Design a protein around this ligand. Structure first.
Ligand code: FAD
Ligand code: FAD
Ligand code: NAI
Ligand code: NAI
Lengths: 521, 521
């Protein structure tokens, strides 16, 4: 039922065919079936690339035909007349099946190819339906890109029959696997959303496709945040990635040494950092965890970060700001009395125990230095050391043994933190030698057994000291060009919020200075 | 008119006399005069240390007598009867004149000796006056300690005459130099205040007498303040001295990079630092200027700071935090448009000129680096260099010559900053070669001619680099033990508030670590 212009115009399009096309028909003795036989022979006529063939014993619509390549059973099937407004759809299904390319978003297309679930679409149209082609053409394209997406297009002029049976009251009307999918004007983009629950992952492929950063900051505590603020203010493209925005300050309550602010709270401060961050153009990336640094192979290259989630981000410069973890005793009551008398930091919380008894756990330099600090402020200090002797510098031991409100206990292993449901009232320990159990009354317990930088994931990539800290010069430079570090994860001597933010700012200004010094066209 | 017990009791006191005493009398033919002749002979009788003598031709009260040493005319004069309630006063004037010491505050006493103005006190008393001795004894003491303080004590029983003439209506009644001084119960301490306007200076001697500090921080900008906060929280004795609390932040308006605080103001922030400081036990000392450091001569000693005002403060540890000054162009309009388009700091104020034209003054690394920064953010940058060529690193010059929104001008000397009464609209300069004058339209002018640390006053005391910065290691340690430095006055690579506070905190924790490591009984 091709007219003069469709025939001549189709001859033009058909010479685009790089591949062989077969139209496989399944037909009864109906007038319409003859209508369709005729049509297919008319098209086979117009190119040696197209051959027409019958198989009338197949479990499908009569009349219908498949458009495929030789040997495949993959491609769009029309049932009824593929003309009317759908002539362009017919041409197009032929063209694609014979290797003319889609006009579409290539990315969308590869998305379609790699899709797991099975699917059997069916669209209802009528020849006069001005809107049905885009939808038909959309879903035809799918059947060609992936064999697990079947698509039959149904002309309602033939099966006025079936329109009734599924009570379709308006066309185009799409169905998936028997279930009603939707109707009216749906672009390819919208159908593909609806269909694939898909990979949730691609924040992942989403990360992989983002552009290289001028600077990418890893770790979003105080240090990383300060870095980000200083970076974005120079207008360079900046990314701040980390596991959990706020870092260690999220798990603290009272903070009295964030200079200028007499008293704030961990949560308030983390939120105030977020707000200060969001004033600038910063790609903030939360709950991602860096698992490797790949240093640039050349002086104008890109550094790369891998994430535990599998993604790879790229940057001209990196700032690592992953902080550290204070070693826990791991004993019953510890978790329960964090911030309620169990603390990890004498500078932070010392003044809160004037008049009170406290313990320090750890006989290293950390603890011993902590006990002398606390001794000056508190009514009494007990230091518990796990081993038979203290690890501290002798000159610190002497000094701590000099004082008159301190007790040192050796071989002592804390077994329990004791509170009253609200706050610490004591401590329980074991003599590791005798196995006997002892009890102390106190209000504060300062754990000073060790810091652990969050830097194992950099082994071999940048240089660390013997405690895991990333070595930096005053400019926050590591031993790899273009890679900087700030905060508790570095060799910086003291671990504090106001110190962390400062280093962050420094690292960023060094990063900027590096970027501008390094280009050479 | 001495009775048995006064005579015997006075014999006891008189053997305390280490020095010779003379009582010089001036007398008429009155009964009272005879009363007084008698009395003086009775006392001369009681010790060979006391001789009595007459000179009846003297321009003074009759009867009166002076109590002095041989040859002097210095000491207290009584007129009328020195008995009654005033017997103890008489004894005491004799004792002091013969070298028994005062019961008083020695410091108060030396204060009295060194006092410049002349003064002629006169006190009115009556014998029955129970309160007059303390006052009489007070002012007698003065006449002995300093010859420019005269004091006659007047018994109103003799000159009931004079009581009338000066309408004294209640005793004790003191007079200075004819003028009425006051009356009733005045301790020595209160008379001495009233009398000497004195040295205002002694904040000065007041500083000199204060106890050694555990730590003394010099300079009270952001860095010194942070140091002080961290120090006092360890409860050590801490002093913060500086020229003007707040440092450079007092002369700035908008601050958008004090991390966590999106927008504050110089004045607000300085005040918020003061408040955070005053939460702790910190001796704050304002408007004092350090002019020299004297390093301890031994490892447990004291460092000393001299002040321009002459005082010397002492400390076991020092933190220098004296900051820096940005070089001014020194041209008309500069002062007028500070904070209104003339600025000293691209990191600080860069984002405020998006879309605007600006100039950078200075072709060093500072300026050149600034111009590249600004180039990325602003519509156009002009750099003016005073000399025939830029001092910047070649690699920075190339990079700045690469850009498409920058102009470089050589031999250019800015003559005027032009505003509209409210903000900068342009700039005027001189070609130093031709002498011709040029004009530029712009909104911002970034002066980058040089930083000058405020450290000349340390020449020879601690090591500085070739730009005057105090050299520090990561722990803020200088090349003198126990001396630390923080902030813009050091080698720290970038000059910012948040960086300054961090260093301050670090310096303090290092100072503390030094104190506790250094004692050895
Ligand atoms: C309970 C407690 C109380 C404290 N109280 C005070 C106080 O009163 N005053 C004070 O000055 N300081 C206090 N501190 C210390 C202060 O919180 C830290 O020194 C500071 O938070 C360190 O800043 P930072 O950004 O360098 O590191 P962090 O705060 O440790 O932040 C680093 C961030 O990076 C994340 N990260 C780690 N590894 C990775 C990775 N591989 N990839 C991505 N992200 C990663 C971490 O999860 C964290 O979110 C306290 C600390 C604790 C634990
Ligand atoms: C106009 C202007 C705007 C700025 N804007 C910003 C901004 O938006 N953001 C930002 O991060 N930074 C900004 N800064 C920079 C910031 O103010 C400084 O980096 C910071 O104040 C330095 O801190 P500091 O305590 O080390 O030194 P200072 O702030 O310089 O303070 C040192 C103090 O010590 C005093 N002192 C000096 N010599 C002596 C002596 N011999 N004895 C006693 N006292 C002495 C000084 O008078 C001063 O009071 C700006 C600076 C200026 C000038
Ligand atoms: N200001 C300075 O220069 C400082 C230097 N340092 C140095 O850096 C490193 C860090 O020192 P520290 O943090 O003290 O580490 P450390 O390993 O030297 O000290 C840890 C201590 O904890 C003890 N311990 C472990 N588990 C215990 C438990 N459950 N109960 C009681 N005690 C337990 C160990 O016996 C040891 O004495 C050290 O090598 C030290 O020399 C430490 C702090 C500051
Ligand atoms: N990131 C880094 O490593 C940095 C390094 N530096 C170094 O530290 C030092 C500080 O550098 P700068 O502050 O740039 O000092 P500088 O002395 O090198 O630069 C000052 C410049 O100002 C110019 N100048 C002076 N008065 C002028 C006026 N009225 N008008 C116009 N121009 C005028 C001089 O000709 C000179 O080019 C330098 O020695 C530099 O090498 C400087 C900045 C940062």
């Amino acid at each position: 039922m091709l007219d003069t212009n469709m025939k001549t115009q189709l001859k033009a399009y058909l010479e685009k065919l790089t591949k062989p096309v077969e139209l496989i028909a399944t037909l009864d003795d109906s007038a319409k079936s003859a209508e369709i036989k005729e049509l297919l022979a008319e098209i086979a006529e117009l190119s040696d690339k197209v051959t027409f063939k019958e198989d009338n014993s197949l479990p499908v619509r009569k009349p219908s035909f498949l458009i495929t390549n030789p040997g495949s059973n993959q491609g769009p099937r029309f049932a009824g007349s593929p003309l009317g407004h759908e002539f362009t759809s017919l041409v197009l299904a032929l063209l694609w099946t014979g290797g003319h390319p889609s006009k579409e978003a290539q990315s969308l297309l590869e998305q379609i190819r790699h899709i797991d679930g099975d699917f059997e679409f069916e669209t209802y149209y009528s020849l006069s339906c001005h809107n049905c082609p885009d939808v038909v053409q959309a879903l035809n394209l799918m059947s060609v890109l992936n064999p697990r997406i079947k698509h039959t297009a149904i002309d309602g002029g033939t099966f006025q029959n079936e329109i009734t049976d599924r009570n379709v009251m308006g066309v185009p009307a799409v169905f998936v696997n028997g279930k009603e999918f939707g109707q009216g004007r749906m672009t390819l983009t919208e159908i593909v959303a609806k269909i694939d629950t898909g990979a949730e992952k691609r924040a992942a492929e989403e990360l992989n496709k983002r552009d290289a950063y001028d600077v990418l900051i890893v770790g979003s505590g105080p240090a990383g945040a300060a870095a980000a603020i200083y970076s974005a203010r120079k207008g360079i493209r900046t990314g701040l990635m980390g596991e959990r925005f706020g870092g260690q300050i999220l798990d603290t309550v009272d903070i009295e040494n964030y200079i200028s602010v007499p008293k704030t709270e961990g949560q308030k401060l983390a939120g105030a950092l977020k707000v200060h961050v969001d004033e600038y153009d910063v790609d903030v990336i939360d709950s991602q965890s860096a698992s490797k640094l790949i240093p640039a192979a050349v002086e104008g290259g890109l550094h790369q970060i891998e994430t535990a989630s599998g993604a790879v981000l790229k940057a001209r410069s990196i700032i690592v700001a992953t902080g550290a973890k204070w070693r826990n005793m791991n004993v019953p009551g510890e978790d329960q009395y964090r911030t309620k008398g169990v603390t990890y930091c004498p500078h932070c919380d010392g003044p809160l125990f004037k008049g009170k008894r406290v313990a320090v756990i750890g006989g290293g330099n950390s603890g011993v230095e902590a006990a002398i600090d606390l001794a000056g402020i508190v009514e009494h200090v007990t230091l518990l050391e796990f081993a038979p002797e203290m690890k501290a510098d002798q000159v610190l031991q002497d000094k701590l043994r000099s004082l008159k409100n301190v007790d040192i206990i050796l071989n002592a292993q804390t077994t329990e933190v004791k509170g009253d449901g609200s706050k610490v009232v004591g401590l329980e320990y074991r003599d590791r030698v005798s196995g006997d159990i002892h009890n102390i009354e106190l209000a504060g317990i300062f754990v000073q057994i060790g810091l652990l930088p969050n830097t194992n994931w950099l082994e071999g990539a940048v240089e660390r000291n013997r405690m895991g800290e990333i070595i930096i010069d005053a400019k926050c430079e590591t031993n790899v060009k273009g890679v900087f570090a700030a905060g508790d994860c570095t060799t910086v001597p003291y671990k504090q919020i106001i110190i962390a933010t400062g280093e962050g700012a420094k690292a960023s200004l060094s990063a900027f200075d590096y970027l501008i010094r390094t280009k050479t066209a």
